Amino acid sequence: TKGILGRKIGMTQVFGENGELIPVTVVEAKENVVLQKKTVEVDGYNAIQVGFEDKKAYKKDAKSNKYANKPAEGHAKKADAAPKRFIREFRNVDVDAYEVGQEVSVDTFVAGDVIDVTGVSKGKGFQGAIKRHGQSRGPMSHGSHFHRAPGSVGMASDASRVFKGQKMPGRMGGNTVTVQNLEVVQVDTENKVILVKGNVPGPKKGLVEIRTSIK
Amino acid sequence: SRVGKKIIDIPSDVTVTFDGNHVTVKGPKGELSRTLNERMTFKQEENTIEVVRPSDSKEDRTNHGTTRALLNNMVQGVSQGYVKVLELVGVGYRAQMQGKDLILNVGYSHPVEIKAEENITFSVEKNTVVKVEGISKEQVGALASNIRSVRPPEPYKGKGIRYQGEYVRRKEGK
Amino acid sequence: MIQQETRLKVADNSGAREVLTIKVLGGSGRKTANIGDVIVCTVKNATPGGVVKKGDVVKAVIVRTKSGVRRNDGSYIKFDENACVIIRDDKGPRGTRIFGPVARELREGNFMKIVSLAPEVL
Amino acid sequence: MKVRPSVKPICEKCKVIKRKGKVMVICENPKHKQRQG
RNA sequence: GAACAUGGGUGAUAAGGUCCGUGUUCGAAAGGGAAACAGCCCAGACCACCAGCUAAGGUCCCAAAAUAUAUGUUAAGUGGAAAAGGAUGUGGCGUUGCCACAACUAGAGUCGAGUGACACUGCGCCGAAAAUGUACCGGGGCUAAACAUAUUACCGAAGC
RNA sequence: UGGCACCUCGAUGUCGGCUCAUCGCAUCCUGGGGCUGUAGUCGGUCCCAAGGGUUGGGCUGUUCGCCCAUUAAAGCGGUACGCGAGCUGGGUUCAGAACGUCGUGAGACAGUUCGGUCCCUAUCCGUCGUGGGCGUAGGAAAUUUGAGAGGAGCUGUCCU
RNA sequence: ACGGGAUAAGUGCUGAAAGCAUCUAAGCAUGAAGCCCCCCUCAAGAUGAGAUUUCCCAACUCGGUUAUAAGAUCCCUCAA
Structure with a gap:
């Protein structure tokens, strides 16, 4: 049900209804090819594999991730295509169609269709307790020695240990988050880009998979 | 002990044949129903x-x-095969039928719909009232009762739809 | 952004000159309020003559604040002071005159009687 | 209904039968009616 | 000096309270049973053994020995935690009496088969609300692997 | 509020408030009801229901308590009367003073009032993050099934 | 803020102890912000170590020592 993979480019704004201002996120979805599919007889569930950007050659003197390896190259030769960089699975779409080896599209979604965006977060690293969580700080005057720090972490003799999940200082980092109820304002087929009304998680030039509002 | 030797007839449009733990009434009166009657020596x-x-x-x-x-x-x-009547207390029940889906109204901004099952006949001589039939009171009964209790009739002032006849607790206030 | 303990300049002819908001009625937890909101305040400075006296608890709708008010077209509008009009608990002004301009957000707040005396309506 | 431990057949119209845990009473008037508490 | 069982005072026929009297155990006592538990039940270790018979308590699995036999009682998991009361609960003990009592009705006539107060009971039922987590059968689990009797068999200590 | 004196005097070191919680039901709000001396809105007593909510100020140090203005509501409790090797030091509660009653006097009463040093580099368990080693009957790379575990859950007004 | 599967106080139906009558002795449809499912994140150290596609393959002699192959790193220029 309209499954594709894109890459966050930046952000901007456009005008639509009479004179309303709507901020959008420029997503760039280029060459998208479908790989091997999974059936309920062999695998055990219905799902289709899809690649993204292509790489160079393989089996040479490369040491970076720019070139592919025998394993990947060999698995990409079965679909009669080039080695991809990003690979994901869509078990929410139909497996009856999407002939293996054939590419996807970019005009599959029509302006006004509800979609769901998914991706990793930015990342801040080791954070505090009033930053990672919504905790408040203590007084800064009246001879106080308690500022940006956590308070009590348990009772007294009731329990001689700390309960699991006490919201202690840690590393925020970036976990995979999904945003629902997202609409498509426009869809360009010349530059193969999609305009989503709102903001998606992740930094610049980052992976971002789109789907269809399951509701 | 209660009702021991009350051995009464079975003069039917039907017959009874026992193999299992039950009966089955095939008769032109009512064709072929039964549950499991008794695991007793029947x-x-x-x-x-x-x-x-x-x-x-x-x-x-x-x-x-x-x-x-x-x-x-x-x-x-x-x-x-015996289902009796129901009552029409007030002004403005819209009584009808649509196959196995009747209608009334109570004074809701929106008449909410109710639909029923078969093997309990949907019988309508009803213009602001209810009077239905069927075969087995076990199956006409709970529906003769879902229809009883739509807007529990005004236990003060008369409006509602209910059963064949009793008194209701009629209450008074300021 | 009009929170608790804030002095405003009433732009009416009732008899008040300055009031101090006591509570921003609107819900449990409400802190601030923008153009098109009702707040409960008290007269801190009045004038010899009128119906409102000093030390009276009355209601009023803040109109034209220092903070901006974003629209739907992407345009903003901010004044150089924070004013307000005293109501009569019936979406109606206690006075009959209004000084200074007003915003066009009172029309959506069912205040057609307050946007019929204001000289300008930006 | 009412709820007190001392249920009985209350007036000269209410008479009792055992239910699951309640030995409550059935009759013609909702001013004499009780279930064990 | 302490608890347990009895005989009293004092306090509130309150306290793991406090003071006397008569016993036993701990103190100064290991071993077996009470899930773990100085004071409760059984029993007093001179040393060796890959011998045998018993005590309290026990015999479906954890975990040694009956998924033993005969008879009743119990439908709550009662067993496996409280009381005044309450009642168309009941297996046993005595009544009382219509040959009507379930659909009769005064606020009168039938048809077909059990009705009840009262009395002593035995086992149940409701009365029954607490703070980290099932949460007193020790756990899995049991309609007998529960209770009341009888007779047996066998297991069981550093006792003989 | 008390009674008893069983653990701690080679130290179990502090009442409110701040910060952050978690559990209960004897239910403040929301919900599902029989019943009202419930026509309707409303509201009174009872039954079931513990998921999530449960406001900012003025006044003495107040755990209390009255008042102002709101809110769907501003419930009652347990957790060393939760939490000082997380904070404050106002209240108690040390050496200086003043008044009041009492004492021959040194003083006492806590009756009031003003001023008065809050120490510690985290070994073990616990909790919040993040790596190294080996295991899975050949070795390696990439995409995955989900037995389990956590998070979420509230509510108002208008057009009709 | 939705949609299911059960249920608790109530509500009637089938239908009783004890012939008439109770929602219980067997069954029954209803039935709540509660409980399972559905939404989102982590999940085979789930030693019960799962599954799918692709890549790699030996001389000694099988004391296994020597070894290479797919791949992985050390080292260097860097930041989503």
């Missing part, structure tokens, strides 16, 4: 099933009055 000799199973167990005297009546209500309501 006989049916020349016309009827009045089988002297239970005695000397406290459970047995309610088992008698229950399972002679599982057989009894089944065979009769599937032979006889």
Whole structure:
């Protein structure tokens, strides 16, 4: 049900209804090819594999991730295509169609269709307790020695240990988050880009998979 | 102990045949229904099933009055077929039918719909009222009762739809 | 952004000159309020003559604040002071005159009687 | 209904039968009616 | 000096309270049973053994020995935690009496088969609300692997 | 509020408030009801229901308590009267003073009032993050099934 | 803020102890912000170590020592 993979480019704004201002996120979805599919007889569930950007050659003197390896190259030769960089699975779409080896599209979604965006977060690293969580700080005057720090972490003799999940200082980092109820304002087929009304998680030039509002 | 030798007839448009733990009433009156009547020692000799199973167990005297009546209500309501009337207390019930989906109204901004099942006939001589039929009171009954209790009739001032006739607790205030 | 303990300049002819908001009615937890909101305040400075006296608890709708008010077209509008009009608990002004301009957000707040005396309506 | 431990057949119209845990009473008037508490 | 069982005072026929009297155990006592538990039940270790018989308590699995036999009682998981009361609960003990009592009705006539107060009971039922987590059968689990009797068999200590 | 004196005097070191919680039901709000001396809105007593909510100020140090203005509501409790090797030091509660009653006097009463040093580099368990080693009957790379575990859950007004 | 599967106080139906009558002795449809499912994140150290596609393959002699192959790193220029 309209499954594709894109890459966050930046952000901007456009005008639509009479004179309303709507901020959008420029997503760039280029060459998208479908790989091997999974059936309920062999695998055990219905799902289709899809690649993204292509790489160079393989089996040479490369040491970076720019070139592919025998394993990947060999698995990409079965679909009669080039080695991809990003690979994901869509078990929410139909497996009856999407002939293996054939590419996807970019005009599959029509302006006004509800979609769901998914991706990793930015990342801040080791954070505090009033930053990672919504905790408040203590007084800064009246001879106080308690500022940006956590308070009590348990009772007294009731329990001689700390309960699991006490919201202690840690590393925020970036976990995979999904945003629902997202609409498509426009869809360009010349530059193969999609305009989503709102903001998606992740930094610049980052992976971002789109789907269809399951509701 | 309660009702021991109350061996009554089975003069039917039907017959009874016993193999399992039950009966089955095939008759032009009502064609081929039954549940499992009784895991008691059930006989049916020349016309009827009045089988002297239970005695000397406290459970047995309610088992008698229950399972002679599982057989009894089944065979009769599937032979006889008897649902009585319901009431029309007020102004402005919109009584009708749409197959197996009737209609009324109570004074809701939105008449909410109710639909029923078959094997309990949807019988409508009803213009602001209810009066239905079917075969087995076990299956016309709970529906003769979902229809009882739509807007529980004004226990002060008259409006509602209800059963064949009683008194309601009629209350007064300022 | 009009929170608790804030002095505003009433732009009416009732008899008040300055009031101090006591509570921003609107819900449990409400802190601030923008143009098109009702707040409960008290007269801190009045004038010899009128119906409202000093030390009276009355209601009023804040109109034209220092903070901006974003629209739907992407345009903003901010004044150089924070004013307000005293109501009569019926979406109606206690006075009959209004000084200074007003915003066009009172029309959506069912205040057609307050946007019929204001000289300008930006 | 009412709820007190001392249920009985209350007036000269209410009479009792055992239910699951309640030995409550059935009759013609909702001013004499009780279930064990 | 302490608890347990009895006989009293004092306090509130309150306290793991406090003071006397008569016993036993701990103190100064290991071993077996009470899930773990100085004071409760059985019993007093001189040393060796890959011998045998018993005590309290026990015999479906954890975990040694009956998924033993005969008879009743119990439908709550009662067993496996409280009381005044309450009642168409009941297996046993005595009544009382219509040959009607379930659909009769005064606020009168039938048909077909059990009705009840009262009295002593035995086992149940409701009365029954607490703070980290099932949460007193020790756990899995049991309609007998529960209770009241009888007779047996066998297991069981550093006792003989 | 008390009674008893069983653990701690080679130290179990502090009442409110701040910060952050978690559990209960004897239910403040929301919900599902029979019943009202419930027509309707409303509201009174009872039954079931513990998921999530449960406001900012003025006044003495107040755990209390009255008042102002709101809110769907501003419930009652347990957790060393939760939490000082997380904070404050106002209240108690040390050496200086003043008044009042009492004492021959040194003083006492806590009756009031003003001023008065809050120490510690985290070994073990616990909790919040993040790596190294080996295991899975050949070795390696990439995409995955989900037995389990956590998070979420509230509510108002207008057009009709 | 939705949609299911059960249920608790109530509500009637089948139908009784004790012949008439109770929602219980067997069954029954209803039935709540509660409980399972559905939404989102982590999940085979789930030693019960799962599954799918692709890549790699030996001389000694099988004391296994020597070894290479797919791949992985050390080292260097860097930041989503």
